[PDB]
């Protein structure tokens, strides 16, 4: 939603 | 005698063959009826801007400029190249020769002629040009930017400015894929409204004008259906959408599968191949289809040296002509060593494409990423033939990092990240370059403390002096010379940042103003930190407690401000001194 990854 | 100015990218072969000369106030232009229309336009704009009229009838007392492609039959060009040729160079290459009052540009193709003009534009200062023999060409055949970050998409004016910037730095690729554009992803089936289509047309036109391949990306992986009539219909939605952009002039397409729940590797690859056959190949003037798989970093792609299920199936199925992108060893990561590209290129039996997540900052928005390409192996072109960086939502300051990406992908083996970083700031900032270096130097390292880490360390030379100071103190050596040196650096950080706040144009200033404020705060806190060291040394309690409170005040401001900068250097020094 706001960035990739965890 | 005239010097070769800062050039970007670094041309492969350059020799100075003379003292230089001044270009007359009016020039003979030769070969422009046959030469690449975009190259000539670039040349015309430059000439107009620098007050150089073009003669209507040949005049032997004025400089002569000859321009053209290998494949134009213009002998007056071959004469002025003087045995130098672009014939044997790779696509996009060129030859440039300035000697004895003549400048000759010969492109391997038109892209090459345009790039020849860009180098010409960089060589001329106040009408003076060095006399040089250049042959030049790119290491990586596709070079540019993927606008694929999360958060506020670039504006129309941002993108037009970026496109002019790419052309000037010989970047030939721009991928339109903003995550938060509703029609790119969330609502990929829906047509762009008429006015948005007009903005598209503008970007396409500007791209062609600057030799940039506009790649139209689409991200249907959230809710696309693969089977039966639904799969038909969904597939035809991709066709309809790509068609409407084709019909405006787009000749590159990307279909992306990153960050989605559905991991049907075979179905993803089947969609690609089908689009490759019914669209890319059918059209016949469309470039190779680009993609990113749902597993797109080595960590997610590979397990104990062998590909995971999704990756293995996807590699097995995906057509060989399709470009496949990957981010390197992690999503945001320090390095792409040669051995990582070797592993992945091996799984895909092809040359790879990189989606490099720097300077993107969507995962840690408080910091600017203002350093050079760093950690990317200089032999990477052996397994990679397509290179793109993911920029920040801040278009203006992304230019610093992109500048260095132009150099690294054009002339890879010669790339020196510190020299390229310095050159970027010098070329972009002018009178303010020295001060911008001081500020940017503290803002090169991205580290969200968990999974995301990349970029050159923050101000390493300063960190070394700080480290050195703690050593001189805990082994009670005389530290006083280092302490004066360090007061100068902290004063300088503050001086420079105040100068930027006062003198930067709006377009840069509105992107970094909060981070400038932050580095001034930290500099002030570093200064009080030294006052603390000095007063403890002087056994002065009054001075120590006063300096200590001021140091804590500065750190408290930085800890609770949105802006983040110099975490491990200017910031940490204050934390270190409070122990
Ligand atoms: C995941 O990583 C970056 C950083 O958050 C993000 O901008 C991008 O859209 C994602 N995709 C890829 C392929 O890196």
Author numbering:
A (entry chain T): 402 to 407
B (entry chain A): 40 to 618
Reproduce, without paraphrasing, sentences from the article in which this PDB structure was first reported.
Here we report that CpOGA, like hOGA (Schimpl et al., 2010), possesses activity toward synthetic glycopeptides derived from validated O-GlcNAc sites in the human proteome, namely p53 (Ser149 [Yang et al., 2006]), TAK1-binding protein 1 (TAB1, Ser395 [Schimpl et al., 2010]), and hOGA itself (Ser405 [Lazarus et al., 2006]). We generated an alternative CpOGA crystal form with a highly accessible active site and determined the structures of CpOGA D298N in complex with the p53-, TAB1-, and hOGA-derived O-GlcNAc peptides. Hydrophobic stacking of the solvent-exposed Tyr189 (Tyr69 in hOGA) aromatic side chain with the −1 and −2 peptide bonds contributes a major amount (∼30% of the buried surface) of the interaction between the enzyme and the peptide component of the glycopeptides. All three glycopeptides adopt a “V-shaped” conformation that allows the sugar to penetrate the OGA active site. Interestingly, for two of the peptides, this conformation appears to be stabilized by intramolecular hydrogen bonds. For the p53-derived glycopeptide, a hydrogen bond is observed between the aspartic acid in the −1 subsite and the threonine in the +1 subsite.
Reversible protein O-GlcNAcylation is achieved by the action of two enzymes, O-GlcNAc transferase (OGT) and O-GlcNAcase (OGA). We report the molecular details of the interaction of a bacterial O-GlcNAcase homolog with three different synthetic glycopeptides derived from characterized O-GlcNAc sites in the human proteome. In addition to extensive contacts with the sugar, O-GlcNAcase recognizes the peptide backbone through hydrophobic interactions and intramolecular hydrogen bonds, while avoiding interactions with the glycopeptide side chains.
